[PDB]
């Protein structure tokens, strides 16, 4: 109440900040011709 | 191929494997089915 | 049809001009994924 929040705010924060996001790859199929780099893109990982 | 190697590179080497089998062994070889994408260590742009 | 898809309306501009899907992207039939190039004697192929 102090900060004008319900458990809905908490639940929304937890699902947003504790997430495993798939973000694709740099230089992935289908590729441009003459590409040397193929690396995974990493974004949010579940908290631990 | 090694870690990071783009599909395009793995194709060069694959086109070489088919070339050799279609010349140096023309008498024994019937066909080469080249699969630039997956091996048996895994799938990935660096395997074939 | 790719033609139907390109004619998808994304936005109407303030002056009244249309922003179509083909205005921001390249519609084309293609594959579910591009991870495996399979050549047969260096020709494009499919199979079972």
Curated annotation (Swiss-Prot), chain B:
Induction: Positively regulated by MarA, Rob and SoxS transcriptional regulators (at protein level). Disruption phenotype: Loss of susceptibility to contact-dependent growth inhibition (CDI); inhibiting cells still contact the target. It is found in: Cell inner membrane. Belongs to the resistance-nodulation-cell division (RND) (TC 2.A.6) family. Homotrimer, with large domains that extend into the periplasm, interacts with AcrA and TolC. AcrA may be required to stably link this protein and TolC. Interacts with AcrZ. Part of the AcrA-AcrB-AcrZ-TolC efflux pump. AcrA-AcrB-AcrZ-TolC is a drug efflux protein complex with broad substrate specificity that uses the proton motive force to export substrates. (Microbial infection) Involved in contact-dependent growth inhibition (CDI), acts downstream of BamA, the receptor for CDI. Its role in CDI is independent of the AcrA-AcrB-TolC efflux pump complex. This is Multidrug efflux pump subunit AcrB. The gene is acrB. The chain holds residues 578 to 625 of 1049 of the full protein.
């Amino acid at each position: 109440n102090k900060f004008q929040l319900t458990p809905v705010d908490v639940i929304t924060a937890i699902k947003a900040q504790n997430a495993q996001v798939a973000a694709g790859q740099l230089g992935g199929t289908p590729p441009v011709k003459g590409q040397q780099l193929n690396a995974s893109i990493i974004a949010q990982t579940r908290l631990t | 191929l090694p870690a990071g190697a783009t599909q395009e590179r793995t194709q060069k080497v694959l086109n070489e494997v088919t070339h050799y089998y279609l010349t140096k062994e023309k008498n024994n070889v019937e066909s080469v089915f080249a699969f630039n994408g997956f091996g048996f260590a895994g799938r990935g742009q660096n395997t074939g | 049809s790719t033609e139907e898809f390109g004619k998808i309306l994304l936005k109407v501009n303030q002056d009244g001009s249309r922003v179509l899907l083909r205005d921001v992207a390249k519609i084309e039939l293609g594959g579910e994924n591009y991870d495996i190039i399979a050549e047969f004697n260096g020709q494009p192929a499919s199979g079972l």
